């Protein structure tokens, strides 16, 4: 009798865990936990958990845009996250999340691909940002985006040079250089029950028994990078402006958190 | 081109191979030494049992998706998926793998089947899923230990725990067996070895090895040394499990 048990709390303006329908759960990060990787970031929202490792490599660009350093995300929902996933190739949710992360990276323009070209037409960086879920208690997109941004700030790259005599490039793993990122896109999630009831940061069950879901990415300068609205019972702008406000608030909060962290190092 | 992942570049080589330097060598140390170990069981929630182990730069998870319906024929099964995260190691490898992941998976299965008693889990397959977040030395042994912890945590029956230990060989003129090494001591090495046993009943469960060289007596000394290391390591894991059980008692 799950749904009924849940409507009782919903109408008491609460949830069975102790959250007031509009607040998230304990959000925490950990930077630089990993040496083998250029950038590393652990994120966890109470029970939900995500980890991003960003490696850096060389590669030859395309012919349409030689001055473009690729940024390739891939999300991994291994079977140890939840039992709804099975050992094998990637399912559907992983792939959807991957395309979401890529759309974000491409639209928010947090990073200029041009800032990754060493020798146009010949070399350019490729940033393989690999995200891994470890507890899919719910709201995996927020965690994925936040971990991506955190690690992608942690990343400091080496410096390379070109020798015309050898016609090859050399690296200097001693000196390095951080990675400039302009926008700080944060993602805020929503679960829409029958008609008008929007809860924020929905956990697992709340997403299992929901009529629809929503996600909204809100850049710092009062703009949006993505309004992910896969199906749902419907919405009018009045049930949407409020979500945008709450998204701005969450942006503020998590950016303050991330600043405190990068400064506590 | 894979149509289940994002369109990246065809090929991509790392920058290190384009470096110019003689990497630093470790030097000297106490051969019979062990790294500081942090082992905790009960980390993950959505899993019946989970465990986490850190030893130096080594960082490994293991989860146990429990019995899932699927005498000597109605005998349980356990299928293990070892998997190193693409952001571990100097080099990057696509997530799939298909060369060494499966070898180490076979190793885990061959080292766990003995300890676990599967007569009490018939018509069932236990999905063990290991994950290697960072490689910093003895990896397969950490994975064995973590899978053992995760199983013992989920409450599957057993006969004893599994303790692993990795060894390497110093290529110096006086080659000594180096215990619980680092990725540097392991890539600048001649031979490598891995033992795994059940210390109460003193029985190996799965071992492995390889060598630029060696000889019977040397391998035997290596074996006994790894056994002693595993013995000296066991109590940590004991205390970890006790601690997790106490936390459960606390929750209710």
């Amino acid at each position: 009798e799950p749904l009924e048990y849940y409507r009782r709390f919903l109408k008491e303006n609460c949830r069975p865990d102790g959250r007031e329908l509009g607040e998230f759960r304990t959000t925490t990060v950990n930077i630089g936990s990993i040496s083998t990787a250029d950038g590393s970031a652990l994120v966890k929202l109470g029970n939900t958990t995500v980890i991003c490792g960003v490696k850096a490599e060389f590669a030859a660009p395309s012919t349409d845009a030689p001055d473009k350093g690729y940024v390739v995300p891939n999300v991994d929902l291994p079977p140890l996250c939840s039992s709804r996933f099975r050992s094998g190739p990637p399912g559907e949710e992983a792939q959807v999340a991957s395309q979401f992360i890529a759309d974000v990276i491409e639209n928010s323009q947090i990073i200029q691909k041009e800032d990754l070209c060493i020798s146009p037409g010949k070399l350019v960086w490729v940033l393989y940002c690999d995200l891994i879920c470890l507890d899919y208690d719910g709201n995996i997109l927020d965690a994925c985006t936040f971990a991506l941004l955190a690690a992608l700030k942690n990343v400091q790259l080496p410096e390379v040079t070109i020798n015309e005599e050898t016609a090859l490039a050399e690296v200097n793993l001693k000196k390095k250089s951080y990675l400039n990122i302009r926008t700080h896109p944060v993602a805020t999630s929503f679960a829409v029950f029958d008609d008008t009831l929007l809860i924020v940061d929905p956990t697992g069950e709340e997403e299992h028994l929901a009529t629809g879901t929503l996600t909204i990415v809100m850049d710092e300068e009062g703009k949006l990078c993505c309004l992910h609205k896969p199906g749902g019972s419907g919405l009018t702008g009045a049930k949407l402006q409020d979500c945008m406000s709450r998204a701005v608030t969450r942006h503020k909060e998590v950016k303050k958190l991330m600043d405190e962290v990068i400064k506590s190092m | 081109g894979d149509h289940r992942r994002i369109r990246g570049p065809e090929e991509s080589q790392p920058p290190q191979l384009y470096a110019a330097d003689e990497e630093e060598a470790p030097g000297t140390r106490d051969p019979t030494r062990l790294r500081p170990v942090y082992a905790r069981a009960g980390l993950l929630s959505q899993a019946k049992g989970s465990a986490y182990l850190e030893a130096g730069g080594t960082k490994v998870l293991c989860a146990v998706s429990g019995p899932r319906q699927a005498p000597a024929a109605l005998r349980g099964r356990l299928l293990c998926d070892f998997r190193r995260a693409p952001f571990a190691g100097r080099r990057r490898r696509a997530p799939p793998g298909g060369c060494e992941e499966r070898e180490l998976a076979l190793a885990l299965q061959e080292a766990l089947e003995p300890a676990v008693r599967l007569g009490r889990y018939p018509r069932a397959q236990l999905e063990v899923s290991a994950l290697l977040l960072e490689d910093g030395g003895s990896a397969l042994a950490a994975a064995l230990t973590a899978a053992a912890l995760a199983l013992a945590d989920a409450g599957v029956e057993m006969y004893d725990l599994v303790v692993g230990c990795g060894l390497s060989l110093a290529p110096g003129p006086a080659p000594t067996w180096l215990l619980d090494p680092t990725r540097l001591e392991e890539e600048r090495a001649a031979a490598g070895l891995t033992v795994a046993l059940m210390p109460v009943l003193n029985q190996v469960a799965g071992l492995l090895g390889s060598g630029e060289g060696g000889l019977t007596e040397s391998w035997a000394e290596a074996v006994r040394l790894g056994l002693e290391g595993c013995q000296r390591l066991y109590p940590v894991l004991q205390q970890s499990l006790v601690r997790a059980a106490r936390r459960r008692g606390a929750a209710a």
Partner: peptide
């Protein structure tokens, strides 16, 4: 062997 603290999963 002595122990350490979780660089990644502290409690």
């Amino acid at each position: 062997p002595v122990q350490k603290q979780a660089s990644l999963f502290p409690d």
